[PDB]
From Swiss-Prot, chain C:
Cellular component GO terms held in the UniProt record: cytosol; extracellular exosome; extracellular region; ficolin-1-rich granule lumen; membrane; nucleoplasm; nucleus; proteasome accessory complex
Official protein name in the record: 26S proteasome non-ATPase regulatory subunit 3
Residue positions, PTM Phosphoserine: S393, S405
Gene name as annotated: PSMD3
Pfam family, one: Rpn3_C
From Swiss-Prot, chain D:
Compartments where found: Cytoplasm; Nucleus
Function statement: Component of the 26S proteasome, a multiprotein complex involved in the ATP-dependent degradation of ubiquitinated proteins. This complex plays a key role in the maintenance of protein homeostasis by removing misfolded or damaged proteins, which could impair cellular functions, and by removing proteins whose functions are no longer required. Therefore, the proteasome participates in numerous cellular processes, including cell cycle progression, apoptosis, or DNA damage repair.
Residues represented out of the complete protein: 24 to 59 of 406
Lineage, top ranks: Eukaryota, Metazoa, Chordata, Craniata, Vertebrata
Source superkingdom: Eukaryota
Organism: Homo sapiens (Human)
Stated name of the protein: 26S proteasome regulatory subunit 8
Assembly behavior: Component of the 19S proteasome regulatory particle complex. The 26S proteasome consists of a 20S core particle (CP) and two 19S regulatory subunits (RP). The regulatory particle is made of a lid composed of 9 subunits, a base containing 6 ATPases including PSMC5 and few additional components. Component of a complex with USP49 and RUVBL1. Interacts with PRPF19. Interacts with TRIM5. Interacts with NDC80. Interacts with PAAF1. Interacts, in vitro, with the thyroid hormone receptor (in a thyroid hormone T3-dependent manner) and with retinoid X receptor (RXR). Interacts with ERCC6.
Curated annotation (Swiss-Prot), chain E:
Protein's job: Component of the 26S proteasome, a multiprotein complex involved in the ATP-dependent degradation of ubiquitinated proteins. This complex plays a key role in the maintenance of protein homeostasis by removing misfolded or damaged proteins, which could impair cellular functions, and by removing proteins whose functions are no longer required. Therefore, the proteasome participates in numerous cellular processes, including cell cycle progression, apoptosis, or DNA damage repair.
GO cellular component: cytosol; extracellular region; ficolin-1-rich granule lumen; nucleoplasm; proteasome accessory complex; proteasome complex; proteasome regulatory particle; secretory granule lumen
Protein name: 26S proteasome non-ATPase regulatory subunit 6
Subunit structure, interactors included: Component of the 19S proteasome regulatory particle complex. The 26S proteasome consists of a 20S core particle (CP) and two 19S regulatory subunits (RP). The regulatory particle is made of a lid composed of 9 subunits including PSMD6, a base containing 6 ATPases and few additional components.
Keywords: Proteasome
Gene name as annotated: PSMD6
Residue ranges of every copy of the PCI domain listed in the record: 182-350
Record PROSITE patterns: PCI
Provenance organism: Homo sapiens (Human)
UniProt similarity note: Belongs to the proteasome subunit S10 family.
Top-level lineage group: Eukaryota
GO BP annotation list: proteasome-mediated ubiquitin-dependent protein catabolic process
Swiss-Prot record, chain F:
Name listed for the protein in its UniProt record: 26S proteasome non-ATPase regulatory subunit 14
Family: Belongs to the peptidase M67A family. PSMD14 subfamily.
Function: Component of the 26S proteasome, a multiprotein complex involved in the ATP-dependent degradation of ubiquitinated proteins. This complex plays a key role in the maintenance of protein homeostasis by removing misfolded or damaged proteins, which could impair cellular functions, and by removing proteins whose functions are no longer required. Therefore, the proteasome participates in numerous cellular processes, including cell cycle progression, apoptosis, or DNA damage repair.
Lineage: Eukaryota, Metazoa, Chordata, Craniata, Vertebrata
Parent-protein start and end of this portion: 254 to 310 of 310
Modification Phosphothreonine occurs at: T13
Superkingdom assignment: Eukaryota
Disulphide bridges, residue numbers: none
Quaternary structure note: Component of the 19S proteasome regulatory particle complex. The 26S proteasome consists of a 20S core particle (CP) and two 19S regulatory subunits (RP). The regulatory particle is made of a lid composed of 9 subunits including PSMD4, a base containing 6 ATPases and few additional components. Within the complex, PSMD4 interacts with subunit PSMD7 through their respective MPN domain. Interacts with TXNL1.
Tissue: Widely expressed. Highest levels in heart and skeletal muscle.
């Protein structure tokens, strides 16, 4: 380990971390927070900016993306922040009406960006979507009408079969 | 049983459990809770 | 010279049981484990860990280890006369002059029970002869003429690995004594190896030592060496938890009943540091209620401070004071105000507890707490207020918790729907939440869904008490 | 030494004789409860 | 011979909480020092009160008079023990030596309590012991005194006991149960009210009337409420000299709430200004408020803050933090809305939690007894 | 209601098992006769809950 | 209602009083409270347990 101090050390961790942040990992983020923790808060903007940036991403701001993109080339993180724009947009494809009433053109313009390409039109013609009259809905019921069968009885009757069966053969 | 890593490692105090269920809540203040009558 | 008779007595009471009795419990015994003197000897090792072991000072220097390691011989039935030698050598400490013959002269003393005669065939006497002298040497780690000798004594214990691996040549189950002693002494291996530096090829020692205990003798070795390996990967950088994710073979009889408890604690710290709330807090809970006793002073306490870090990260925790040792109070001077900062929603205090106690937070060393504890504060806010009111506004809660704008309150409510706590939607014109609580959710067929698990769990424990009733 | 572990390891399975020692003792117990 | 020293409890609390009268304690307690020759009203006022410009000579000449009474005791004890009397001179010295503990510091306690502590022989030689350690444990902030001497009295003095003095022990235990906020037991032990007119231990039986109302307003149920202060009058005479207490209990029986603000503010003024309450008052306010709020919501369901603002005034964002932290304090099962303005009364008892509590006990209890049955193998 | 009214006197036995050290000649066992009745009676009730889902299809 | 002479729910929003009641379920009450007493008795057997162990 006693090597000469690596030149691109600060941003190879950042390349890996921003790639991880692009591919939506859940625990390699924290083994990254464990392998070299002491150089994260004091210094190393290539790491100090992505980790508080992640705090801001799961704080509730996709606009800190652009506040940050004020300055993040950081020797070709440009492809990775393009994949970060992609993980903005497909997480909009998820989180645009998770359990919302309805949005309109202007909330598309706020949460989405690039006012109207054929890409939000592609969303409206790609996810099974009703482009209402300057208006949006997930569906006509948004939940596909949950009753689940209207029979909770006979499956738990089979459960009673193997349940009484396991209470049998034992004392 | 010390066999692990560890060989390096209700006077006013159970009232403090309900009081730390109360510490962010109305210390005494008694005037506020008596002067909320007469502002209307 | 009147106190050293107490080590003179307990020393003979130990190796009487160990040598003669567990050798007779090894000759033909151990149907499952009839070596009850093995657990008796681990009780006496805990007894030598309570007391001074035998000869650390004991008002003299170096009496028993040059004495009793001679002349075992296992022969014609007058070897109780060699025991009489062992007993009547004890005029030297009381009457004669004591002399220093430990930690330097032990190097042929360990070879004396082999160079007397072909003593016997079993390895627990050899593990005795290299453990019962040398475990009284390890707990004096003053790093001057004592730790290089712990080092070499456990190199003789690595020779005990060699004579654990190539003795009885297959299937004599003396591992239910030597792994029982080797759990302890391999923890002391890791202790003395990491009192100086991290251990590097001792990792492969531990790997192959886990390998050799795979199927032929899979009794108390795999889980304990896996605790060693787990705390190895815990103290240093964190790369090989994917090894447990791909090779999860971690299920013995869970024999020592506290080894499994602290094992679940350590892997709860693992899943706490990987990423988990639910499964990690339930195995922390199971290790918490699987605290064996409180017969060991304040050892649950620091480890519990690091245990319920995830419950602090829940946000649904009150003050934790029922655990508090008063000798832990001067160390939880940060931690008491930290759970107070959990109960409070202040932001300047959320960072001023950090600005006040970052050094003890480094003593924790687990800033995964602070990377999500602000998010925990806003989730505490959303759980409280979203359980409180049916149709709240996002502006009320927002500018009650200083959010200053509608759209980040929208992102909060949206990521809370994404995190799934309440139904709460937005009367979309400029925000202004239209929402509801949830009573009349369900209450009758849904309990009896879980009652299958209730009573199937009960009948599992019925049959377990049946298979435990089988033991007498 | 190939198969020469397995029979002695099935002799390690002979707690069946002790759990059934309790069972055969209970056989005797309640059978002579009955006969009594 | 307890009541001026229970006023010393009153007055050490006067030194403790009210700093609005920062020397009224040393005023009437230095008067209580220059009468009865009590020297602890400037021992502990030398410790905890002011820094004493000059009262040295004019009170240490009476410390010499304290020594005069103390040494005529310390000569009466040997010049009287000549007679063949079983613990008689011991009783004559314990009376005036625990009265010296009334006079002086814990030197009086160590030469009195520990002296007539061991060789006790009779009903009075342990009755006076338990009561005269109960005095000083009630005076200071001690707990082992007032509880463990009563545990001794339950061991020693009883053997089944008398009819009165066991109820006096109940009065003392109910006074700890009002010192701590033990709600049910304070009123349960203050139930009787037949044998405590005024002893030498009651400087104010009307303070016993305050102690029974100040816990009966919480713990006592509503059929119990009518059963105590409607079906019976034996407390209602001595609090029909105190009509606003009767008025507050009948308004509690009525549900009118602005007079709850009024008279609960009266009780909370006294709750700051009565001892054995100062580590404990914070729970009281919101507890009585929610004790009314439960039956308030038990009225009906489609309630508001206007029909309740008639009773509350401007209880609009008062009830924001008030009722929301009643919701978040694990209390007050309800649902509440802002502009649709729902209120909810709910919880029928045969629903889920009474079904839940069994495995709530016997999961931790389960694996407890399971690991206790896993110590058995190895 | 049988299976509660006799269960309270069933649980009047472990208080009698608290003999703190030992003060009771032999187990004097009243565990049984309320295992088996509950067992087979609620086997009958659960298979009766089966019976409507059995006869109907 | 608070004196149990009148079992139901009033209203202020829609102005609709509705009387109904069903308190007693001993299937829940007697069973579960006797289980609470059972658990207290098992805690009383926890010292037979803690006595046979140590």
């Amino acid at each position: 380990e006693q090597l000469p101090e690596s030149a691109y050390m600060h941003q190879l961790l950042g390349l890996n971390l921003l790639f991880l942040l692009s591919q939506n990992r859940v625990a390699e983020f924290h083994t990254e927070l464990e392998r070299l923790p002491a150089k994260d808060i004091q210094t190393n903007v290539y790491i100090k900016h992505p980790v508080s940036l992640e705090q801001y991403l799961m704080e509730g701001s996709y606009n800190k993306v652009f506040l940050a993109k004020g300055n993040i080339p950081a020797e070709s993180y440009t492809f990775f922040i393009d994949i970060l724009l992609d993980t903005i947009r497909d997480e909009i494809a998820g989180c645009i009406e998770k359990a919302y009433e309805k949005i309109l053109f202007t909330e598309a313009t706020r949460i989405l960006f690039f006012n109207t390409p054929k890409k939000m039109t592609d969303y409206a013609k790609k996810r099974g979507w009703v482009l209402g009259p300057n208006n949006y809905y997930s569906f006509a019921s948004q939940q596909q009408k949950p009753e689940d069968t209207t029979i909770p009885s006979t499956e738990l009757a089979k459960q009673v079969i193997e349940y009484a069966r396991q209470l049998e053969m034992i004392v | 049983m010390s066999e692990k890593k560890q060989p390096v490692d209700e006077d006013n105090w159970d009232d403090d459990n309900v009081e730390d269920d109360f510490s962010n809540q109305l210390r005494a203040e008694l005037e506020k809770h008596g002067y909320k009558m007469e502002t209307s | 010279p009147p106190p050293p008779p107490a080590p003179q007595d307990v020393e003979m009471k130990e190796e009487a049981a160990t040598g003669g009795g567990s050798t007779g419990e090894a000759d033909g015994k151990t149907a499952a484990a009839a070596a009850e003197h093995s657990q008796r000897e681990l009780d006496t090792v805990t007894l030598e860990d309570i007391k001074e072991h035998v000869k650390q000072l004991e008002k003299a220097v170096s009496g028993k280890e040059p004495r009793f390691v001679l002349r075992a011989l296992r022969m014609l039935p007058s070897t109780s006369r060699r025991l009489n030698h062992y007993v009547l050598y004890k005029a030297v400490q009381g009457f004669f002059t004591s002399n220093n013959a430990t930690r330097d002269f032990l190097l042929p003393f360990l070879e004396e029970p082999m160079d007397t005669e072909a003593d016997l065939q079993f390895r627990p006497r050899t593990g005795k002869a290299a453990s019962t002298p040398l475990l009284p040497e390890v707990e004096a780690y003053l790093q001057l003429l004592v730790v290089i000798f712990m080092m070499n004594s456990k190199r003789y214990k690595e020779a005990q690995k060699i004579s654990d691996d190539l003795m009885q040549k297959i299937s004599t189950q003396n591992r239910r004594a030597l792994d029982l002693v080797a759990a302890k002494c391999y923890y002391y291996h890791a202790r003395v190896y990491e009192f100086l530096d991290k251990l590097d090829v001792v990792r492969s020692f531990l790997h192959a030592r886990l390998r050799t205990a795979t199927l032929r003798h899979d009794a108390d070795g795999q889980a304990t060496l896996l605790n060693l390996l787990l705390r190895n990967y815990l103290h240093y950088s964190l790369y090989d938890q994917a090894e447990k994710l791909v090779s999860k073979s971690v299920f013995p009889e869970q024999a020592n009943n506290n080894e499994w408890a602290r094992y679940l604690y350590y892997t709860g710290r693992i899943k706490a540091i990987q990423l988990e709330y639910s499964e990690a807090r339930r195995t922390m809970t199971n290790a918490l209620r699987k605290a064996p006793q409180h017969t060991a002073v304040g050892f649950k306490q620091t480890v519990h401070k690091l245990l319920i870090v995830v419950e602090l990260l829940l946000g649904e925790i009150p003050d934790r004071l029922q655990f508090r040792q008063p000798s832990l109070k001067r160390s939880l001077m940060p931690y008491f105000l930290l759970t107070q900062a959990v109960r409070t929603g202040n932001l300047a205090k959320f960072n001023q507890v950090l600005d006040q106690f970052g050094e003890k937070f480094q003593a924790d060393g687990t800033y995964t707490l602070i990377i999500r504890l602000r998010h925990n504060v806003i989730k505490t806010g959303v759980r409280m207020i979203s359980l409180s009111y049916s149709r709240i506004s996002l502006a009320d809660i927002a500018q009650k918790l200083q959010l200053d704008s509608p759209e980040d309150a929208e992102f909060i409510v949206a990521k809370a729907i994404r995190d799934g706590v309440i139904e709460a939607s937005i009367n979309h014109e400029k925000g202004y939440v239209q929402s509801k609580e949830m009573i009349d959710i369900y209450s009758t067929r849904e309990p009896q869904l879980a009652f299958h698990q209730r009573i199937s769990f009960c009948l599992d424990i019925h049959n377990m008490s049946v298979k435990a009733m089988r033991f007498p | 030494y190939l198969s020469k572990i397995e029979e002695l390891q099935l002799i390690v399975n002979d707690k069946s004789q002790n759990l059934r020692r309790l069972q055969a003792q209970r056989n005797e117990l309640n059978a002579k409860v009955r006969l009594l | 011979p307890k009541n001026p020293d229970l006023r010393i409890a009153q007055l050490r609390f006067l030194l403790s909480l009210p700093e609005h009268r920062g020397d009224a304690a040393v005023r009437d307690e230095l008067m209580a020092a220059v009468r009865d020759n009590n020297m602890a009203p400037y021992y502990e006022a030398l410790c905890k009160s002011l820094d004493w410009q000059i009262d040295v000579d004019l009170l240490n000449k009476m410390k010499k008079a304290n020594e005069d009474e103390l040494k005529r005791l310390d000569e009466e004890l040997e010049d009287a023990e000549k007679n063949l009397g079983e613990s008689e001179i011991r009783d004559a010295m314990m009376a005036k030596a625990e009265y010296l503990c009334r006079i002086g510091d814990k030197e009086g306690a160590l030469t009195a309590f520990r002296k007539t502590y061991d060789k006790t022989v009779a009903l009075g030689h342990r009755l006076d012991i338990v009561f005269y350690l109960l005095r000083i444990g009630l005076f200071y902030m001690d707990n082992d005194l007032i509880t463990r001497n009563t545990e001794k009295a339950k061991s020693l003095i009883e053997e089944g006991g008398d009819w009165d003095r066991r109820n006096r022990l109940k009065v003392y235990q109910g006074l700890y149960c009002v010192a701590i906020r033990d709600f049910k037991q304070a009123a349960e032990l203050f139930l009787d009210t037949v044998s405590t007119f005024t002893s030498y231990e009651l400087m104010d039986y009307k303070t016993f009337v305050t102690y029974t109302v100040y816990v009966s307003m919480i713990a006592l149920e509503r059929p119990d409420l009518r059963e105590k202060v409607i079906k019976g009058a034996e407390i209602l005479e001595v609090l029909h000299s105190l009509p606003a207490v009767r008025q507050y209990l009948f308004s509690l029986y009525e549900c009118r709430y602005s007079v709850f603000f009024q008279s609960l503010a009266v009780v909370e003024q006294e709750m700051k200004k009565d001892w054995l309450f100062a580590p404990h008052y914070r729970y009281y306010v919101r507890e009585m408020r929610i004790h009314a709020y439960s039956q308030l919501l038990e009225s009906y369901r489609s309630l508001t803050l206007g029909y309740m603002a008639e009773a509350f005034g401007v209880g609009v964002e008062f009830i924001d933090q008030e009722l929301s932290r009643f919701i978040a304090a694990g209390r007050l099962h309800c649902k509440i809305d802002k502009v649709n303005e729902i209120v909810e009364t709910n919880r029928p008892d045969s629903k889920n939690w009474q079904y839940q509590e069994t495995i709530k006990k016997g999961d931790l209890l389960l694996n407890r007894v399971q690991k206790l049955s896993r110590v058995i193998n190895m | 209601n049988y299976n509660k009214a006799v269960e309270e006197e069933d649980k009047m036995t472990p208080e009698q098992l608290a003999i703190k050290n030992v003060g009771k000649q032999d187990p004097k066992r009243h565990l049984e006769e309320h295992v088996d009745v509950l067992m087979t009676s609620n086997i009958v009730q659960c298979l009766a809950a089966m019976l409507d889902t059995v006869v109907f299809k | 209602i608070l004196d149990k002479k009148f079992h139901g729910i009033l209203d202020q929003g829609e102005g609709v009083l509705i009387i109904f009641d069903e308190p007693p379920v001993d299937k829940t009450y007697e069973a579960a409270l006797e289980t609470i007493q059972n658990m207290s008795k098992v805690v009383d057997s926890l010292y037979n347990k803690a006595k046979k162990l140590t």
